[model samples]
Target chain A: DPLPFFPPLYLGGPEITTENCEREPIHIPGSIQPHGALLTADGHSGEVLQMSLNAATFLGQEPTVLRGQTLAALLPEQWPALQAALPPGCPDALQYRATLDWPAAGHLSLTVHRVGELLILEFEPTEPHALRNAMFALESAPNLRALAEVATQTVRELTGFDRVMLYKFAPDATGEVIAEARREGLHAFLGHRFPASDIPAQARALYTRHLLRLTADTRAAAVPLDPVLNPQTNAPTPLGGAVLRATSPMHMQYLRNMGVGSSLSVSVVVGGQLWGLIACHHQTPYVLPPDLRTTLEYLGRLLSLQVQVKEALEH
Target chain B: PFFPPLYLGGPEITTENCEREPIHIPGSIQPHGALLTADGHSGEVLQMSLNAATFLGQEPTVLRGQTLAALLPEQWPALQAALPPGCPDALQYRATLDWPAAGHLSLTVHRVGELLILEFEPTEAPHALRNAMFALESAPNLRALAEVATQTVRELTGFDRVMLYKFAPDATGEVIAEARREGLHAFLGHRFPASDIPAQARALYTRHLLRLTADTRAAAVPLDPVLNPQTNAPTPLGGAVLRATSPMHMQYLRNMGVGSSLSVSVVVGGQLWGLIACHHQTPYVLPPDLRTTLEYLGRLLSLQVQVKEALEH
Candidate 1:
């Protein structure tokens, strides 16, 4: 009952374009970014259910051969470490350190979370030479101005982005750049306003759930899901929570047109709503910074707290 | 040589003196959970919570000077069987006795040095596995989760105030977020000195995970015979739940006009990360079942928080 199975690949995916990108179901894009692979397995039986086609690129086996083999067979050593800390059926997410040797290589960051007896395991390459800057500023600032600049400057300092902007949204859904860190001779986008349509409604909704969205290479093609549908439900595999979920084609073009090669989006959530974004852009494909998700996730949270404190104090 | 004072008085109860205040073995216990200490070898009763007799339907004098066998003749062997095979530092839910007491009872047992410690808690109908999963799963981020945690725990426990107390790298604690009933003092934005929860208490907090002081106004019930006859010294209450806090903590709460407190540790990686502290304006007694809920929630929050700080080793 718990063998890796993939239904026939359904052709003609979501016909999404920039005109109707907001209606795009990006979370169920039926694919992932090329940087990593995702595997769905039976939470109890440890049997493989579905996998990203690109899995063999990192998994050391072809996607077709991986079926019915079981995650336990593949991750014989590192799997046990996860089983201990794994929650019963939490779709949120849990993680562990994993390394493989038969195909010896650098260690990997294994992110796991349970959804209806299915474990979504994502494997992303780890940065062996990643810098360890343990010190971070999570202190208070006097006013909104001080706090906004700190978010942009700190994010820029840590991410070496050509331009980092704090894009604040208004009640009407339009956004204004309240803060920015312009480096690499990039012109400032500070105080610039953009219509709400710049970001789709679906993309905006996904922000609160998945805090970090990385477009590592806007030009790279989105590697499609193996079957392009759930092996069981026969629907698009839910990639919303996957860290390596691919960006929308239109969004990729939106970036490419701006002469941007990579971008990192960190959501500054306040009271459970998207307050703004600590948006980073680079002219070249930027390597995923070491602990980028962990560090920026924390920084985003710290910024959220400062914003949470200030808004509460204003009353 | 890292011993707390036998008694809680010497210098003024300032933050400075409070840190060094030996809290674990205060020679007393809170009134909610009946406490009993006996000789590890002979089972001779050495000390007890004054209400120990209330559960046994006997007088304090009768249970005080006898062996644990004399007090818990039926439950003694089972408790002994449940003791950790290696040594004593383990907390065990030994037995559930509905005997003389009107309601169902949960008996928790552990050993401290040469003393066999037993605590009895009254439990009624109660539970939570679905709700905690939902709250932890639904919250968008750590702070958002913390905000909901303070609100949810306060709602569940009926406490006057509940705050997510986060620790800085230096051991200082800050009240990052909180929920409170009207008229309760707000500690939402306050930062407390590291000395407030010193190295001694922090270690126990790490080990014990949950701490409760039921009624600060009520008198502390001292062990009938305070000193353990073997060492001629007070017993160490390191990991026990009913262990009485220091006079400094009691006075600290009394000065704050609070009547009861429960502190749940939020550990991240290995170090003490933060605490979910609850306060009641009047004397509050949390049932044993809900105390376990806080324990479950405390652990889940720590694990959930761990997912966010997943970068660190």
Candidate 2:
């Protein structure tokens, strides 16, 4: 259950709302689209948005009176520094959590991307926890998926894409579509092959352009005059030249042939090169409304950052 | 009748007053051949090889009529600015200017008849390349990665010398982070005055990502257009390659008393982090096989640097 409405920021400003998290929990508001989960601190204090339904469970008791309650009052002391160091713009700074004497529905890693004082926090249960469960639960459920698989599934559930896959890049400029979450009736390319040439040397070369590629239509032309190359020209033009021109015309065609009409591929950059692509594909063209698209895009980024953080801490 | 002019690569030639008209040269009818042309006087279009469409990683139509400066990247404006005037013939000359950026540009100059050709053949760059770079960026980390990335490039083109030059925090200090050299007189353990590389040059290095000079001093074989204009007798490209051989850069190197060169750039943390520097005293030309080998090597270096950074963190 989540708090009905988030408390206002700056006293009387617009009341903030998390996606599905924005809802007044119980009496389901018709067509709120059930985004993530949102919770209010006690005494109608501050508002906090967590992007996971499981995370919503933690915020069950809120908006009453958390006045003197600090992050230290909620989460364990081991993580106090992380909470304290949260920058002013980041919402992760507002994470109020703790380990139950018994172990939480496992620990959920929450991260926030801050742009000024406005923070957008994303929540997800750590995969390793699911791995632990998969190991023990295999006795009953024979075909249990691995950690990365469950993660892919969870993201698909959240984003509603037809297929969500983890595409890993190799040293020879090649890639593998590792994990997949698909809608029914879609042909699975899971184990289908794609050559290094499909992405091409030049296409891989542009991975440094940005961490994410948001393509609403597979065959749709790239937005003209991307500021990355030409700053002055905000021109809406067709693709031209080596930079703005599509690097993967053939690859785009191949995907379209394979029935994917829309996609969003985010680069998983580790050690400076592209380690992999967290690809979200849809069989039918799916253009996210700008507002929802922004939310999902930010969530995808947080997922990558969290993966890096946990790997660093545990490895 | 004037014999058709032979362009750099093979087969194709320029028959008409290409510079005067719409800059059109009748291309070859062969499957893989192209009619390449460059200014015999300007050297602005150094060496135009056939199938240049693929060589430049662009369509042949796009590369047609493009100048060395047009293709060479804006960062080497210094190399373009350095051409001595009134030199009819061209010859290869090597330079070692303090490439105002963190790297150094080693140029090769020559003439095809009246064409003054200058190429920023190879750059000796800083060590850190491709830092925090994304593979799918709209703009490839060509400049940033080339900074310290020529290592992986070594395998593509088997050049003797390769180096990554880095600029210190205030952009004052320069260091060689990595290098592989077959020929001696490499840029290792050498330093240049900031004057060698001025502000504009560094800016250009970050802008234009590639440059080349083939036999900097080779005189352009006769093309009929420059033949007294009135008489169609093909004029011998004198002094083109001869004047090209002037020891200006060799003088700079001799002044610094250094040797020959080659190079590229690399991106680190999404910035123009450094350069890959290669040097040689002996004259050299990187063929296609050699060039490809070096590019692969540069990519490997990007991966290695990432691993190294991860360990440091």
Q: Candidates' TM-scores?
A: 0.53, 0.29
How far residue B46's Cα lies from its native spot in candidate 2, in Å, is 16
Give lDDT tens digits, candidate 2, residues A142-200: 12134346556655765699988877767776777767888898777675657665453
Task: Report how far residue A260 has shifted in candidate 2, in Å.
Answer: 12
Off by over 4 Å in 1: A1-14, A84-88, A92-102, A128-138, B1-313
- For B1-313, candidate 2 gives per-residue lDDT tens digits of 2224343232332322222211112122111212233554342342343433432356545554466555555423543443334422322333433444324434444433444433332343311112112211211233434433444444444555556666655555365544465545555546655544444335534532233333333332222223323223333322121112222233444443233445454443434555666654444555422443343333344344444555556
Quality of candidate 2 docking, DockQ: 0.01
Model 2 misplaced stretches (Cα beyond 4 Å): A1-267, A270-315, B1-156, B178-190, B216-260, B269-271, B292-313
- Reference-based TM-score, model 2: 0.29
